[PDB]
Amino acid sequence: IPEYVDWRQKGAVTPVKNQGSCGSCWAFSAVVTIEGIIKIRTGNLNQYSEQELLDCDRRSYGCNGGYPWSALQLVAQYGIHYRNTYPYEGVQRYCRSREKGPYAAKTDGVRQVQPYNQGALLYSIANQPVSVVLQAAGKDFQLYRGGIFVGPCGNKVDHAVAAVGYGPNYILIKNSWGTGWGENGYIRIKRGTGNSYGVCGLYTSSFYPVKN
């Protein structure tokens, strides 16, 4: 369980993206999750469509609300297309999955990490990236243009992102905003403080598919 875990230089995460004026956090976080695992075994890095997840997942409320843990489940159940055969537009619409044709990616299950346990988060993040939530409605996290976020912030979780590494002290997160935020679309939050919930409630509820 290395002292350092970066999947970027591991060839697991692709360039950064933006959800835009679309409250669709959840589908983006997922595509990165599934994505990671998909490349971890096969040795093939891919960019899947979040747009599809939006238009297809009726359980989620597309362009403004969702469950990073429906998306995944969805995929495993059905599947998910490339981000070319289903590029992101930013507006929820009619499911094209079927109309689009044969799927391209399809997992083999979804599991959740025991909330409120850093030790647990890491491990999984060590075996493969994960979808995690937190407080973004933040007025500080909103302004982050590079650094180690300690706060201030709260325990009112409401935005989903992704963890793509950690250090002895900083946890790495991929944001669904442009590369005109944090440190090039990236933000480092601090771990090991005692805060069980985890600063910004980053330890509330996390997840991930399964792959054979």
Ligand SMILES: *CC(=O)[C@H](C)NC(=O)[C@H](Cc1ccccc1)NC(=O)OCc1ccccc1
């Ligand atoms: C980040 C974003 O674009 C939208 C506005 N918010 C969400 O998708 C959240 C994700 C989340 C899940 C768990 C904990 C924190 C955030 N999802 C969401 O609010 O949908 C839930 C819901 C919406 C409307 C009515 C009932 C429940």
